[PDB]
Amino acid sequence: AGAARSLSRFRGCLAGALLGDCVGSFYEAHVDLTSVLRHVQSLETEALYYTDDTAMARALVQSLLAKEAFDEVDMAHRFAQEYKKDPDRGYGAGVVTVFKKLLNPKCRDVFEPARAQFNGKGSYGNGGAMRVAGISLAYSSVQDVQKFARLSAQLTHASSLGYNGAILQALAVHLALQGESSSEHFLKQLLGHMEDLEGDAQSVLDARELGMEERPYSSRLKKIGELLDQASVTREEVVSELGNGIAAFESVPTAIYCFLRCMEPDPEIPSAFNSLQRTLIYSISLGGDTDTIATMAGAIAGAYYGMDQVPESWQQSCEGYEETDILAQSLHRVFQKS
């Protein structure tokens, strides 16, 4: 609410992400709309633990705040120390190898452990994107959002399939912080940026080496546009065309679709729930990697709808919600310079 990049949008963004992670984590790797509507009834303190999505998002934001800038060695070290402090947050199986290499003080090029992952091709998991929302709070221009979404993602995700998913998620939060938009304008801006990135020769090769379609994020954003004009869209159709998995390309477009779809009321979700709430409910109903898809749709929706749509009863159920709010306020003061 309010002006572009307002305090309310900053707070709402990080709280929306935290709600998505904590509430989504109950359905992790499973889901039906009726049973989700039953499960959110228990939300009406800090009993819901957060996962790696929030742990890494907190480390990313604390690094930006400590250096008032992107610092790859500070951020890599905060990622690795956060893992060491609490390894049981539900990290991806591969990225733990990156953390353990970063914890070796002999490692003096912090981008190289990510590049060795998966036979030297790098991870395409959604972990670079799940934590990226703070980049869009710290940087206002598209150029800087792309640049540091990429760099922060590359600390663990060296494949363009992974870091371009982080950029797409950061760009979606960047646009949501600007306020009112049609769904079709929002989508068209994202598609334009991804078509530009996916023209790059390294992206084309990464996609071809995996057997994927030309311009994979651009293709899925086009599928979102078709789905948004389609009659009687079912959850099975959404999952079939966009995915609900741990790969960045099977979850980041899915999160954006959930945001865009839920800009309008849904007769199947009770009207007592506000727009942020129905986005999270809809996201979780897709199943699959629910904590990460919901954390990403929640970061976008929180930035768009602001803190007045963050319900106190939901927020106060989440582990660390006060520290999340303080970090959002600090980003607004330090980087937006209020």
Contact between residue 26 and residue 330 where contact means Cβ atoms under 8 Å apart: no
Among 1, 103, 115, 118, binds ligand AR6 (CB under 6 A): 118
Q: Which residues pair with 295 in a beta bridge?
A: none
Q: Provide the H-helix boundaries in 155-268.
A: 160-176, 183-197, 201-209, 216-228, 235-242, 252-261
Q: Is 48 helix (H, G, I), strand (E, B) or coil?
A: strand
Nearest distance in Å: CB 144, ligand AR6: 23
Q: For 281, how many CA atoms within 13 A lie in the half-sphere containing its CB?
A: 26
52 binds ligand AR6 (CB under 6 A): yes
54 binds ligand AR6 (CB under 6 A): no
Nearest distance in Å: CB 289, Mg ion: 4
Measure Cα distances from 154 to 26, 34, 79, 277 in Å.
29, 39, 12, 32
290 marked as binding residue: no
Subset of residues 142 to 201 that bind ligand AR6, contact rule: CB under 6 A = 159
**54 vs 146, beta carbon nearer Mg ion:** 54
User: Which parts of this chain interact with Mg ion (CB under 5 A)?
Assistant: 51-53, 90, 289, 291-292
Q: Residue 83 binds which entry of Mg ion, ligand AR6, none, with Cβ cut-offs from 5 to 8 Å by kind?
A: none
Nearest distance in Å: CB 118, ligand AR6: 4
**124 vs 148, beta carbon nearer ligand AR6:** 124
- DSSP structural state of residue 68: T
122 marked as binding residue: yes
Q: Could you give phi then psi for residue 285, rounded to 5 degrees?
A: -65, -15
Residues binding ligand AR6 (CB under 6 A): 52, 90, 92-95, 118, 121, 123-127, 130, 159, 246, 289, 292
